[PDB]
Amino acid sequence: HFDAISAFENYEIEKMRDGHVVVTTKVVNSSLNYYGNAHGGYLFTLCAQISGLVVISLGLDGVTLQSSINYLKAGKLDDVLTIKGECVHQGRTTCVMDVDITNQEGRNVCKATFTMFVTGQ
Amino acid sequence: HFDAISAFENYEIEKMRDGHVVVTTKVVNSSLNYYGNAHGGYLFTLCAQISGLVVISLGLDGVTLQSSINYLKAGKLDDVLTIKGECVHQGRTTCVMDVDITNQEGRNVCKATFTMFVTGQ
């Protein structure tokens, strides 16, 4: 047995403009995996949501086609995670977003790149 | 504003044996994104959890180093998703897991590959 893995039970949107987004969130029990670390799916979901927010901030609608994520350092209970996303490439049908998560000590937690398909304006 | 994104509010483990895992789950409202489709992070978390289950089934402990996911077809409210994970490569220090999600119509929803780091036995 294991409990649900949840993301964004709390959050603060610090910045959302012109393809650049910054959101903060506190790691809580529902964020964790078996080993007491922030779940890789939780961390990914933080990144994917912020990637979507980057899309919206460009006046676009979109869907993720593909994503790659690298895990660098564990997130822990009560960490404050800063999720920074930006559009590195704005093409006609597709956008590429980089999203980076750091903890309250400025340490790198994970980095992801999203390939989004622009569906409309 | 947006509500939390959650994964495994419900599930059934069908198979978990020697590097092969099958788990089913039903898509619910907490699974969805802005547009009413299964959230990319939700789908990834389904895959990531099953990847870790594959690791455990091998009598191993481990952590995800890197993952890539491709989104093929939308997941919808009330879909039953089958999450199939396989260890396609068991190295000494790392394992590589393929995870595929199909819906109740047999349609491919997404595919991911996980690069896991074996921490212990």
Add this chain to the structure above:
Amino acid sequence: HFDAISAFENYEIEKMRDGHVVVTTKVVNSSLNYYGNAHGGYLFTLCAQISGLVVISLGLDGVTLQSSINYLKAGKLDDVLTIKGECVHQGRTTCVMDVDITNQEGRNVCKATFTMFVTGQ
């Protein structure tokens, strides 16, 4: 100093039809890296070329948007590599190709997934 890294100085196309491609090639000196193993770029290029051939076999033109590759086992001088590609998903604007390389002993060398953008028919 280092010499050029080259791919397809020799090859045999065994199969090319309906989204399924099989090509063989022999690892030669220009294939190798500093350590005497098949260069990761060489192996990737084998996969990317076969992904393109899968596109053509579907009566399409296309360009790669994104690719992810996992390296499983070293390729060595004089290995015969079998490169098998297939379209796992044929969407309207994009295709997803899986490409797998095995050696003459049937051992898995590397696996890659390509997200291609369909440019025309």
Add this chain to the structure above:
Amino acid sequence: HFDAISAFENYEIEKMRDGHVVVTTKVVNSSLNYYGNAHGGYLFTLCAQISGLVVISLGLDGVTLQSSINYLKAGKLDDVLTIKGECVHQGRTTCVMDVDITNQEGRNVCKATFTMFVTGQ
């Protein structure tokens, strides 16, 4: 029929120091694909070679475990490509390298992330 795809028929190492590498190269006919653009495999090989150079610059020996690449803008015959590699994370067992290619106009051509396995020192 198609001719071999080659990388580093010419190059200039501009910088190679403590985890940071810059290398330039000019796109030639052997660099290109069917459509006359820089081959995705050629571009990846440029990135992969520079990733390994980053590893060496850290006094390390290593092998690529996994890589992801995004293609942003076509490379063309006679372009001068600048290949910039950085170790963004030096773990104990693995390193993560970001590699970016820009052309002579400062335009972003592609970006890749490499997950390297440290074999020795």
